[PDB]
Amino acid sequence: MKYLIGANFKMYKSHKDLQEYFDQFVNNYACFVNIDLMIAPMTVCLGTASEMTKDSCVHLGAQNMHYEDQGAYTGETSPLILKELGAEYVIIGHSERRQYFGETNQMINKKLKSALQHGIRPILCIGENLEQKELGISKETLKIQLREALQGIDTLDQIDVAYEPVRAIGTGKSATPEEVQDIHEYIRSVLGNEKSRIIYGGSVNDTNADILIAQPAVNGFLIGSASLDPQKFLKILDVVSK
Amino acid sequence: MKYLIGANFKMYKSHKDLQEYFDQFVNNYACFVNIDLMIAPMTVCLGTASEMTKDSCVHLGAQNMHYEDQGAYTGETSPLILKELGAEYVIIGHSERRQYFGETNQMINKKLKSALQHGIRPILCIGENLEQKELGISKETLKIQLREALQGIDTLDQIDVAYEPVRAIGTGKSATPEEVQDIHEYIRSVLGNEKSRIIYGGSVNDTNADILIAQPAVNGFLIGSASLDPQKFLKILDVVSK
Amino acid sequence: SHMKYLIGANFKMYKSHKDLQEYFDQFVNNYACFVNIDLMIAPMTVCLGTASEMTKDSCVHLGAQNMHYEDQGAYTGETSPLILKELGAEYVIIGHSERRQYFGETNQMINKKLKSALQHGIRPILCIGENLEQKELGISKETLKIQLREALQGIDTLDQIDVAYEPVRAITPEEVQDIHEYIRSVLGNEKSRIIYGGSVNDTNADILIAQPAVNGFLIGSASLDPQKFLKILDVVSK
Amino acid sequence: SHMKYLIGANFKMYKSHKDLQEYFDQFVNNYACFVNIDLMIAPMTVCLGTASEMTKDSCVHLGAQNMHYEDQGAYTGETSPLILKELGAEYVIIGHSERRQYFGETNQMINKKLKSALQHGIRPILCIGENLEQKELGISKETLKIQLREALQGIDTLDQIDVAYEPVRAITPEEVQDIHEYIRSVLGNEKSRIIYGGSVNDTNADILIAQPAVNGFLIGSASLDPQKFLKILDVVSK
């Protein structure tokens, strides 16, 4: 098992920002033997990113994907194209897709199935909101998200999971490290598998990445905002390599 | 007013399919003086398309777009990037986005506003389904789609409209030409403007494009499936140039 | 002259059993039973048994504020149209804006309710109305045509159905006429009554009723006072 | 022994006024008023006035099949908890699966209804239950905890509330016990009754009631026959 540390750029970076990111990053990243490093740029920029990860230890990830190979899905992205560009990961069911764009557990289930059919390693995002935590149904919320997402899939070891707690308020610490460990243990139990990476996609930055990755159930990170500054993201990768 | 004829590829074509399309197409299209020719490839391929429309009379169109310039919108496409690639059109509120991916009139309204802020010419898609037509509320359905979409926008002449009747059953003729004319007249009335192109995005192919474009309220087409075969799409453009 | 005006009291969720008794006593014994007016009172569903006892052998027609589309079955908390018929209910209010927003009336449900009420000879009052955003946008009429068409599909005798128009708003006469006249064209017959459910007091019942497309009223909180409901009917009586 | 069993009849949308009369006469005069049992009958809302007349000066507790969370107001077709209290309703069924699917009960609405029933001293029966996909997936318990927690937020005295568990299905005892025992842990007190709303006939009422976490039943169509409801209660009576 290698750590999986992904950069989720979300809808950020012009083409010049992306070029300057890859220059700063690929001239300074050490390609640590024990880290799977994934960068997921904006989908419209995956072609350009593709030409920068093709000669790199970086793995191209996509932020979303349709479940069909082709068809009448205006504005959607086909897995066939992600395969063409060398995308090796796909972020599936991110909380922002669930909140804003009609992403359901049933469609997530089709996307994970497609990603495995095409040999793309899907990263399934789950997470409870603040109210669900206060009501004490965090683990229960996650189990339902996981079971409806993973239903009918025989080999879960090919799936990674990001625990992404949903938080309308910023905290810089959407959970305590012990809480993350406990959640990740629970998820690992539901997953029934020791090969899936369970990565924390909560608030991760350079001042807590050490105590977070130290937890034995934390198999890496899915980092949003902090990954947009190349220096900060390198500092975090240094911490992970200890 | 030039005719606006767009190709909506939807989620179709590998990179090789797109290259072979542009070779067949750009070696044979006559760049008719009275046609605005737009091609909208899959979003993940807009960078490649961009390099093929940059030296072409073809206008790059996008199939979808977020309303923010940047932010936490995993899997979304920023208008700043479409501007960078030379996209001059954007398809907004296509029926497939409304049916499958949480596209609302309120979000469509923000997307049209953003497209105009950034000088991208938005193509607003409207259309009633079969039941709405049978109930005799076609025009009424369209007026609501249009008014909630266009609310608060002062200069509608910078907006084009595709009348895209929604039809679960194929017919090859989702409306009769006289019906299209009547609908387009109605839309023109709601639009209060003589510069907007109102283009028919119903079932358009090479055997009806002549009687359709002949209607004076039909200002062009938004073609889906028929536009994926380069020869068929050229035959239609020939008909339009008379 | 081919038409009797329909004037209905929608009590909504108001009045105890005793308030309902004080009302009907003071009302039935003092209301003149005008021949031009179908008078309808719709108390709370739980008080329909009391109300029907007080209006048998009276000219007041009993109305229900909602009902279900099945006769019997596993519909916890629902009211069967059979019970309404046994009780002597002649009207039912279908699709009130309050149900649409709070308790999931869809146009599909409304449609089955109107078909049910017709099969049982209960006369339904379909409630349609635009909200303030829809009038501000200028799509009031288109909004109502959608509501009406979706609610009435497959119903061959629209003359059996009355319509109450009420603008949906948080808690002008020519504008009412214009809206009602449009609704009439959507209905495609003259026999249906198009009653106004917006603000109706005594200052304006006469001006409003005089409009040819205004066939009466659906009166909300103003109808809770028997004296006030009587004063409205007298103004309508000219 | 700290507990009285709760056994309720949910008539749903069944029985005319006359069927309801034949029932209560045959029932009240023949039911032994067991001291260990709170006996509850919930007829149609429109028949609650009749029913209360028949059970004043009787041991049968009257239940309502639904209610609204406000006392009065612009809620066309809704039932006020004040009318229920004046009528002598002691129970109300909240959040029945039929309302959840058909007529838009949300957990937020259910929550205001339970708070209302408590403010008025009406004892609510919260209905929770998983569907077949949720049991097939293996998330039955997690599903119920979500329903319970969302329905009970901010309510400080859960002991005032009973729960009916019914698997939601199209129209085993140890498995019931397992589910009820889990629900008990979510409730965090012993005083709440957890009654089973699944299949309960005379062959199995005894085996089911004997489970320590099964505190009674919510009986649907089987309760429509007075003789059958009496035979169930007698089996429970051992």
Three-state secondary structure string covering A77-112: CCHHHHHHCCEEEEEECCHHHHHHCCCCHHHHHHHH
Contacts of C47 in chain D (CB under 8 A): 49, 83
Resolution number, Å? 2.1
Number of CB atoms found within 10 A of residue A151's CB: 16
Handedness of CA A226, A231, A234, A240 (dihedral sign): negative
Inform me whether the C-beta atom of residue C137 falls under 8 Å from chain B C-beta atoms. yes
Supply the DSSP string of B86-101, one letter for each residue: TEEEEEES-HHHHHHS
Q: What is the CA radius of gyration of chain A?
A: 17
D and C touching (3 or more beta-carbon pairs closer than 8 Å): yes
SS3 state at A125: strand
Report phi then psi at B228, rounded to 5: -80, -25
Both tokens assigned to A175: 């959970």
- Phi and psi dihedrals of B71, rounded to 5? 155, -165
Smallest Cα–Cα separation from D77: which of A113, B205, C110, C5?
Answer: C110
Name all contacts of D97-103 with Cβ < 8 Å and 24+ positions apart: D97/D127, D97/D129, D97/D166, D97/D168, D98/C74, D98/C75, D98/C76, D98/C77, D98/D12, D99/C76, D99/C77, D99/D66, D102/C75, D102/C104, D103/C77, D103/C78, D103/C103, D103/C104
Pairing verdict, β C89-94 and D61-64: unpaired
CA distance D213 to chain A (A): 22
DSSP at B151: T
DSSP state of D168: B
D44 in contact with C, Cβ within 8 Å:
yes
Q: HSE on the CB side for A123, CA within 13 Å? A: 34
* Paired residues of C126 in beta bridges: C94, C163
Rounded CA separation B25/B7 (Å): 12
* Angstrom distance (rounded) from CA A66 to CA A10: 17
- The neighbour count for residue A123, using CB atoms within 10 Å, is 30
Nearest CA in chain B to A83: B14
| DSSP single-letter state for residue D122 | P
- Full DSSP string of D187-228: HT-SSS-EEE-S---TTTHHHHHTSTT--EEEE-GGGGSHHH
Write the secondary structure of chain C as one string of H (helix), E (strand) and C (coil). CCCCEEEEEECCECCCHHHHHHHHHHHHCCCCCCCCEEEEEECCHHHHHHHHHHHCCCCCEEEECCCCCCCCECCCCCCCHHHHHHHCEEEEEECCHHHHHHCCCCHHHHHHHHHHHHHCCCEEEEEECCEHHHHHHCCHHHHHHHHHHHHHCCCCCHHHCEEEECCECCCCHHHHHHHHHHHHHHHCCCCCCEEECCCCCCCCHHHHHCCCCCCEEEECHHHHCHHHHHHHHHHHCC
- Is the four-CA dihedral A191, A197, A203, A207 of positive or negative sign? positive
- Residue B170, both tokens: 């194929």
D20 → chain C, closest CA residue: C83
Of the partner residues D77, D102, D171, the one whose CB lies closest to the CB of residue C66: D77
- Kindly state the tokens that stand for B140: 């009424």
Is C99 in Cβ contact with D13 (below 8 Å)? Answer: no
Whole-angstrom distance, CA of residue B230 vs CA of residue B26: 10
Which residue, chain included where needed, has tokens 């009576």? Answer: D237
CB-CB contact of B46 with B82 (8 Å): yes
Domain boundaries, chain C: 1-238
H or E segment and range at residue A211? helix A209-214
For B158, the token pair is: 């910078």
Q: Which DSSP string do the residues of D61-104 spell out, in sequence order?
A: EEEES---SSSSBS-TT---HHHHHHHTEEEEEES-HHHHHHS-
B147, B190 Cβ separation under 8 angstroms: yes
Residue C57 has phi, psi (to 5 degrees) of 60, 45
CA torsion A97-A103-A108-A111 (nearest 10°) is -80
| 3-state helix/strand/coil string of B168-214 | CCCCCCCCCHHHHHHHHHHHHHHHCCCCCCEEECCCCCCCCHHHHHH
∠ CA(D98), CA(D101), CA(D102), 5° rounding?
A: 80
Q: Which residues 74-103 of chain C have a CB within 8 Å of chain D?
A: 74-80, 82-84, 86-87, 93, 96, 98-99, 102-103
**In sequence order, what are the residues at sequence separation of 6 or more whose Cβ sits closer than 8 angstroms to the Cβ of residue C88?**
C52, C55, C56, C62
Nearest to A75 by CA among B88, C128, B92, B23: B92
The identity of residue C16, as a single letter, is S
- Are B51 and A16 in contact, with CB atoms under 8 Å apart? no
Q: What is the CA radius of gyration of chain C?
A: 17
Task: Write down the experimental method used for this entry.
Answer: X-ray
- Nearest-angstrom CA–CA distance, D229 and D213: 22
Find out whether B124 and B91 touch, Cβ atoms under 8 Å: no
Exposed (0-12), middle (13-18) or buried (19+): which is D150, by Cβ within 10 Å? middle
* Subunits in contact with chain A (3 or more CB pairs closer than 8 Å): B, D
Best to test chain C binding among B137, B141, B142 (most C CBs inside 10 Å): B137
Nearest alpha carbon to residue D201 among D222, D180, D217, D184: D222
The SS3 of residue A226 is: helix
**Rounded Cα distance, A78 and B12, in Å:** 8
- Which tokens go with D85? 């209290």
Closest by Cα among A164, A147, A68, A162 to A115: A68
Distance of CA B236 to CAs A18, B173, B230, C69, Å? 40, 16, 10, 52
Query: Neighbours of B (≥3 Cβ pairs closer than 8 A)?
Result: A, C
Rounded to 5°, angle at Cα D21 from D16 and D25: 155
Distance CA D85, CA D63 (A): 10
Which of A65, A72, A155 has the alpha carbon at shortest distance from A115?
A: A65
D42 in helix, strand or coil? strand
Among C197, C109, C196, C194, which Cα is nearest to C153's? C109
Provide the shortest C-alpha distance from residue A41 to chain B (in Å).
9
Is A217 touching B (CB cutoff 8 A)? Answer: no
- List the structure tokens of C118: 């017709």
- Residue C139 · residue B143 · CB < 8 Å: yes
Contact present, C85 and C92 (Cβ < 8 Å): no
Collect all residues with Cβ–Cβ distance below 8 Å to A130 and sequence separation of at least 6: A166, A167, A168, A169
First-residue to last-residue Cα distance in chain A: 16
Helices of type H across chain B: 15-26, 46-53, 79-84, 95-100, 105-117, 130-134, 138-150, 177-191, 209-214, 230-240
Nearest to B143 among C142, C149, C153 (CB): C142
Can you give the C-alpha Rg of chain B in angstroms? Answer: 17
Distance CA D36, CA D233 (A): 11
Does the active-site annotation cover C96? Answer: yes
Backbone angles phi, psi at C59, to 5 degrees: -90, -10
Q: From residue C171, how far is each of C128, C167, D86 by CA, in Å? A: 17, 11, 28
**Cα angle at A161 between A155 and A164, to 5 degrees?**
160
CB-based contact (8 Å) between A70 and chain B? yes
Q: How many whole angstroms separate alpha carbon D171 and alpha carbon A5?
A: 50
The answer to whether D45 faces chain C, any CB pair under 8 Å, is yes
CA distance linking residue D86 with residue D182, whole number of Å: 36
Maximum distance among all Cα pairs of chain B, rounded to whole angstroms = 48
3-state secondary structure (DSSP) of residue B217: coil
Closest to A203 measured CA to CA, from A188, A179, A221:
A221
Angle at B10 between CA B166 and CA A153, to 5 degrees: 95
Q: Per the structure block, which two tokens stand in for C79? A: 């009211």
* Residue recorded with tokens 């409730």: D187
What phi and psi, each to the nearest 5 degrees, are found at residue D97?
-50, -35
Structure tokens at B215: 């209607």
Q: How far is CA D20 from CA B62, B215, D169, D222, D233, in A?
A: 66, 68, 28, 15, 19
HSE (side-chain half, CA atoms, 13 Å) at A11: 20
The SS3 assignment for D31 reads coil
C-alpha–C-alpha distance, residues A44 and B63, integer Å: 11
Half-sphere exposure for B118 (CA within 13 Å, toward CB): 26
Residue with tokens 């005798």: C157
**DSSP symbol at B121:** E
Please answer whether residues B223 and B9 qualify as being in contact, where contact means their C-beta atoms are separated by less than 8 angstroms: no
Q: Determine the Cα–Cα distance for residues D174 and D170; give it in Å rounded to an integer.
A: 22
- The CB density around residue A148, as the number of other CB atoms within 10 Å, is 17
> How many CB atoms lie under 10 A from the CB of residue B117?
11
For residue B31, with 0-12 CB atoms within 10 Å meaning exposed, 13-18 middle and 19 or more buried, which class applies? Answer: exposed
Residue C45 and residue D93: Cβ atoms within 8 Å?
A: no
